[PDB]
Amino acid sequence: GDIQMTQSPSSLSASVGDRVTITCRASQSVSSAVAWYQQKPGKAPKLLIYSASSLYSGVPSRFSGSRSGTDFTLTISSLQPEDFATYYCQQYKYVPVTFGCGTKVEIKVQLVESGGGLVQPGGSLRLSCAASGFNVYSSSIHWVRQAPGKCLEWVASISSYYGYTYYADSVKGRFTISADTSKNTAYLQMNSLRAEDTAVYYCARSRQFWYSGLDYWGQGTLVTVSSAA
Amino acid sequence: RDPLLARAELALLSIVFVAVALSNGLVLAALARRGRRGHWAPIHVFIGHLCLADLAVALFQVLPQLAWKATDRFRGPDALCRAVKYLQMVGMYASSYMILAMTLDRHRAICRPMLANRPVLVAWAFSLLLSLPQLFIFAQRNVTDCWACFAEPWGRRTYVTWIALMVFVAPTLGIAACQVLIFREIHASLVPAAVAKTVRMTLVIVVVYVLCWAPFFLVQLWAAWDPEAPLEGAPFVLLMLLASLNSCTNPWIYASFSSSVSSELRSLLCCESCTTASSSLAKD
Amino acid sequence: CYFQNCPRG
Amino acid sequence: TRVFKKASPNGKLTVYLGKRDFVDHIDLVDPVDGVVLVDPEYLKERRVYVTLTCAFRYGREDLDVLGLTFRKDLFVANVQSFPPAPEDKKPLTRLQERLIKKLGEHAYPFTFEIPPNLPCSVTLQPGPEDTGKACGVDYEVKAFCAENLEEKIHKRNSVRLVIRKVQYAPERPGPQPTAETTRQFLMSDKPLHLEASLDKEIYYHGEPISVNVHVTNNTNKTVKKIKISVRQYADICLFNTAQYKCPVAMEEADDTVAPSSTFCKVYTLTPFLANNREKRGLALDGKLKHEDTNLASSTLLREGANREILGIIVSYKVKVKLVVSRSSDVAVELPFTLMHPKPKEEPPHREVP
């Protein structure tokens, strides 16, 4: 079976300026290639930690993380109002890589994407991510999808410099991925769509020279595959 | 015009033709299946070129004098003289030059590091270029195509010697120098073997080359350089069509040294480890 | 015979 | 942090190292320190040695057939492992003592001071049929319990670990590179001038290289075609100089520089292995066993040495060739440094489990 992560502290609220503890449990030996992503409700994910020990650039030092075997500890000395959002843990040493169901805390670069919308099941549909501000050959490009009430899953990855394609198990040979180097854009075609394909799709840019946690994301586009028109 | 001699020579020519045909065909088939099922090893780029060139030798040479020695005459146009003589001498010359080229390539590659089809082009071009003087050499007929043909009064006494020089002295002595430069096989100081294989293949190739090409050109000189050629009888007639002896063997000569194709043809007779791991530690 | 005066058969 | 181990087949010996790669600052070298867990219970040879080698593999085929390793030992060094030499006293590094306290007395340390001016960990692009160990340049540490050095290495009683060392781009840019030529023909008086310029001396693997090129043609003939080639001078020094040549990136421009005309254009070239897999034997950076690395990094040597190092020297250049209507071909050249950004971590190469 494929490697799973589990997010225990799903529920937490009414915490202000206090110790906030999050644990992610790895179903298998994954060493250190693990990262934590911040996504504001209704927004794009933002890179918090990679390797569980390396703070990302532009991140407050008050956030911290650590590894204890296959368990992984997220520490907040003092919670802030802007930190009430969705949190994700994910290994990045074995393709396919998958996110756990996001950890939501509750209180009382250019990556443009297009192509999605409504579609009937059993069809093909088009998406694209134009990237600007950086260099395509210097990174890999990835497709993740947001299914509500479902753990986030990476679905697609393209390596321009290596020229390789990577897909999830459920999507092998079901979708076509590509990228125009010249236009600096990633193209996507959904062949034989079904009900499981209903999700909100997000664009992720790697940084090729060595793989790490995804840094910058696109706002995403909805894709509802249903008989409704 | 001897009937029994004609029958015997036709039999000999057909037998050697079919022998070289079968040998070269099976060798080239093995090479093609290896290249399709694996690498286009340049080691073999040449042995395959040897196969193709030598099978072309068989096809373009044996059939013409087959046509003459069977029909005992000529029944065609005049430019067919030029065409047939060209397509005949081309194989003889090109085979020798491509042997030269492969020897040179191996000679450089005795210790050559990585270097990412040229020398085969070199050999082919050099052959087609040396194919020039035969234009003004062969003369006209005086019934059968281009009989009593002579380049000049010195054509039968200087051009023949130049042919002999260009076909042996540069080739055989050149390849001789080729292996003798491996004499400096002892590199890398002492050990912290191959000499036997090197010398054993070099000796074999050089001796087969010289011995196989000896009789045709020796009788060539004793019949051309010497006025009033001493022998016109039976012993000369058969031996003047036996130079293709190495054709069925020289590809085998190279294939024997190649442990890859040798094991391939012998199979086609009927055709403790560990793991890296990781741990943690205590800070401070 | 190839490049020399071959005896006539 | 974390530490890597490798367990020997016999289980009597085990090796513990901190980081797989070592930064070659050229001026100094990372001290390569590790430890060996030893089992005297099953040990019988009463002596253990650990040795570190740097070796470049013999090229592909040997005696008209490929396989086996006649690699030349570029540099080998040895050290006692167990029992430790009392005469050998050296200041242990912090990682060494950390591993010692974690494991105990059966862990015995060792340090290797790699001298500067040694070849970078460079690999050669294997052929698709190459099934043996990869050909190229690499370091290898190894452990084995034996009474002395002479004894035949017994594969049931030893262990090996291959390693690589890396260099990195200086943070200080050099002068902006320029080149120019003035080709004149016998047919005309006025000259044909050409100039090329690159923005910075340094580029990172996977990011574009932009060249500003200007041409001034006053001769009677006309410039017809443009060849642009990101190329690589690789020097081989197994026996002597061997500057084997293979370009990595090209493009053809059907642009034209008219007589008495000026041409000013920016050309963008960015190397990538995809269109270079076919170029068998193309130099690449170091590999662990067979994981697809990136392109070969620009070897950086200390200027004090006279560049005689018995190893592959890797330097990347860009070549601009202009062709004139029907000697007419003209070439100009500009070299550029090519190394990775500033390191911060290990090389976590990504692959399926």
Whether residue D148 sits in one domain with residue D29: yes
In angstroms, the CA B215 to CA B260 distance is: 33
**D130 and D68 inside one domain:** yes
The 3-state secondary structure of chain B, one letter per residue: CCHHHHHHHHHHHHHHHHHHHHHHHHHHHHHHHHHHHCCCCHHHHHHHHHHHHHHHHHHHHHHHHHHHHHHCCCCCCCHHHHHHHHHHHHHHHHHHHHHHHHHHHHHHCCCCCCCCCHHHHHHHHHHHHHCCCHHHHCCCCCCCCCCCCCCCCCHHHHHHHHHHHHHHHHHHHHHHHHHHHCCCCCCCCCCCCHHHHHHHHHHHHHHHHHHHHHHHHHHHHHHHCCCCCCCCCHHHHHHCCCHHHHHHCHHHHHHHHCHHHHHHHHHCCCCCCCCEEEECCCCC
**Phi, psi values for residue B154, rounded to 5°:** -90, -5
Cα–Cα dist B194/D64, whole Å = 10
The sign of the CA dihedral D195, D201, D204, D205 is positive
C-alpha B58/C-alpha D9 separation (Å) is 59
Query: Which residues in chain B have Cβ-Cβ distances shorter than 8 Å to C9?
Result: 1-2, 6, 68-69, 72
* C-alpha separations of D49 from A34, B19, D71, D144, D226 in Å: 37, 62, 22, 6, 59
- Specify the pairing of strand A63-68 against strand D137-144: unpaired
Whether residue B204 is contained in a domain is answered as yes
Range B257-261 contact pairs with CB under 8 angstroms and sequence separation of 24 or more: B257/B197, B257/B201, B257/D64, B258/B43, B258/B44, B258/B47, B258/D64, B258/D65, B259/D65, B260/B34, B260/B41, B260/B43, B260/B44, B260/D65, B261/B27, B261/B30, B261/B31, B261/B34, B261/B44, B261/B47
Identify which of D80, D14, D12 has the alpha carbon closest to the alpha carbon of residue D40: D12
CATH number at residue B205: 1.20.1070.10
Q: Are residues D200 and D315 in the same domain?
A: yes
Chain breaks in chain D (C to N over 2.5 A) after: 326
Residues D184 and D267 in one domain: yes
Q: Which of D204, D277, D350, D351 to mutate to test the interface with A (most CBs of A within 10 A)?
A: D350
Domain coverage including residue B226: 3-253
Give yes or no for a contact between B51 and B22, defined as CB atoms under 8 angstroms apart. Answer: no
Domains (ranges, CATH) in chain A? 5-104 (2.60.40.10), 110-217 (2.60.40.10)
- Give the C-alpha separation, A120 to B279, whole Å: 51
Tokens, residue D147: 């009474």
State phi, psi for B165 to the nearest 5 degrees: -60, -55
Best to test chain C binding among B7, B90, B136, B216 (most C CBs inside 10 Å) = B216
* A-chain residues near D21 (CB < 8 A): none
Binding residues of D are: 245, 250, 319, 321
Tokens at D230, concatenated = 């990101």
Distance CA B41, CA D229 (A): 28
With beta carbons under 8 A apart, name residues in chain C contacting B2. 9
Which chain A residue lies closest to D291 (C-alpha atoms)?
Answer: A162
Between vectors from CA A81 to CA A79 and to CA A84, what angle results, nearest 5°?
A: 80
Q: Evaluate whether A98 touches A5 at the Cβ level (below 8 Å).
A: yes
Handedness of CA B122, B123, B126, B132 (dihedral sign): negative
In order of B159, B221, B230, D73, the CA distances from B227 in angstroms are 15, 10, 8, 65
For D287, other C-beta atoms within 10 Å of its C-beta total 20
Cα–Cα dist B120/D191, whole Å: 41
Residues D207, D247: one domain? yes
Residue D159 burial (CB < 10 Å; 0-12/13-18/19+)?
A: buried
Instruction: Name residue D182's beta-bridge partners.
Output: D193
Do chains B and C touch, with touching meaning 3 or more CB–CB pairs less than 8 Å apart? yes
Q: How many CB pairs under 8 A join B and D?
A: 87
**Interface residue D73 vs chain A (CB under 8 A):** no
> D193 with D325, same domain?
yes
* Sheet containing strand D209-217, strands side by side: D178-183, D192-198, D209-217, D261-269
Query: DSSP state, A136?
Result: G
> Looking at the 3D structure of chain B, how many domains does it have?
1
Q: Cβ B220–C7 below 8 Å, yes or no?
A: no
Q: Which of D162, D10, D100 is nearest to B276 (CA)?
A: D162
Is residue B259 included in any domain, yes or no? no
D118 and D54 in contact (C-beta within 8 Å)? yes
Q: Is A228 exposed, middle or buried (0-12, 13-18, 19+ CB in 10 A)?
A: exposed
The CATH number for D66's domain is: 2.60.40.840
Resolution in A: 4.7
Q: What residues of D are designated binding site for 1D-myo-inositol hexakisphosphate?
A: 245, 250, 319, 321
Q: Is B259 on the interface with D (CB under 8 A)?
A: yes
A66 to chain D, any CB pair closer than 8 A? The answer is: no
Question: Is D353's CB within 8 Å of A28's CB?
Answer: yes
- Contact between A95 and D273 using a beta-carbon 8 Å cutoff: no
B124 closest CA partner among B221, B231, B52, B43: B52
The secondary structure of residue D327, as a DSSP letter, is -
Amino acid identity of D52? L
Question: Does A208 sit within 8 Å of D272, measured CB to CB?
Answer: no
Q: Which residues of B fall within a CB distance of 8 Å from C3?
A: 85, 89, 134, 163, 220
The bridge status of strand A199-205 relative to strand A221-225 is antiparallel
Sequence-separated (6 or more) residues with CB below 8 Å from residue D229: D247, D249, D250, D318, D319, D321
Which residues are bridge partners to D217 per DSSP?
D192, D261
CATH number, domain at D206?
2.60.40.640
Domain annotation covers residue B271:
no
Kindly state whether residue D100 falls inside one of the protein's structural domains.
Answer: yes
Please tell me if residue B134 touches chain C, with a CB cutoff of 8 Å: yes
What whole-number distance in Å separates Cα of residue B219 and Cα of residue D198? 70
For C7, the closest chain B residue by CA position comes to B232
Bridge-based pairing state of the strands A199-205 and A140-146: antiparallel
- Token pair, residue D335, equals 């070299």
CA distance D150 to B152: 74
Separation CA D123–CA D139 (nearest Å)? 11
User: For A38, phi and psi rounded to 5 degrees?
Assistant: -110, 125
- Any domain includes D232: yes
Interchain touch B–D (≥3 Cβ pairs closer than 8 Å)? yes
Q: How many structural domains compose chain D?
A: 2
**DSSP letter assigned to residue D96:** H
Length of chain D: 353
Structural domain contains residue D254: yes
D138 and D279, same domain (yes or no): no
Residue D73 tokens read as 């030992």
Same-domain pairing of D183 and D128: no
Range of the domain at D40: 4-166
CA-to-CA distance for B10 and B18, rounded, in angstroms? 12
Is the CB of A31 inside 8 Å of chain D's CB atoms?
yes
Task: Provide φ and ψ at B255, rounded to 5°.
Answer: -60, -35
Rounded Cα distance, A161 and A134, in Å? 15
Residues near D320 by beta carbon (within 8 Å), at least 6 away in sequence = D194, D196, D211, D213, D226, D227, D228, D331, D332, D333, D334
Task: For residue D113, give the amino acid letter.
Answer: E
Is residue B275 a part of any domain in this protein?
A: no
B232 touches C: beta carbon within 8 Å: yes
**D195: part of which helix (H) or strand (E)?**
strand D192-198
Domain final position from D113, D133, D166: D166
Contacts of B260 in chain D (CB under 8 A): 65
User: What are the CA-CA distances from residue D66 to residues D7, D130, D239 (Å)?
Assistant: 31, 8, 20
Q: Are D224 and D310 in contact (CB under 8 A)?
A: no
Structural method:
cryo-EM
d(CA B64, CA B52): 19
Residue B283 maps to a domain: no
Residues D235 and D150 in one domain: no
Structural domain includes residue B284: no
R_g of chain C, CA atoms, integer Å: 6
Contact of chains C and D by CB distance (3 or more pairs under 8 angstroms): no
Within an 8 Å CB–CB cutoff, is residue A216 touching chain D?
no
Sign of CA dihedral D86, D101, A28, D294: negative
**Closest CA of chain D from A8, distance in Å:** 25
> What gap in Å lies between CA D14 and CA D142, rounded to an integer?
10
Task: Establish if D349 belongs to a structural domain.
Answer: no
Are A20 and A73 contacting, i.e. CB atoms less than 8 angstroms apart?
A: no
For residue D343, being part of any structural domain is answered with no
What secondary structure letter does DSSP report for D133?
A: S
Query: What is the rounded distance in angstroms from the CA atom of residue D125 to the CA atom of residue B114?
Result: 10
Same-domain pairing of D149 and D280: no
Strands D330-338 and D202-203: parallel
Cα separation, B66 vs B84, in Å, equals: 12
Let me know whether D159 and D11 are in one domain: yes
Buried b / exposed e along C1-9 (16+ C-beta atoms within 10 A): bbbbebbeb
Residue B67: closest C-alpha in chain C: C9
User: Nearest residue of D to residue B42 by CA position?
Assistant: D64
Residues D300 and D327 in one domain: yes
Cβ atoms of residues D143 and D15 within 8 Å: yes
**Could you give the C-alpha distances from A161 to A127, B249, D208, in angstroms and in order?**
22, 50, 12
The answer to whether A103 and A214 are in contact (CB under 8 A) is no
B111 touching chain D per CB within 8 A:
yes
DSSP-assigned beta bridge partners for residue D144: D49, D158
In sign, the C-alpha dihedral spanning B79, B84, B89, B94 is: positive
Residue D12 falls inside a structural domain = yes
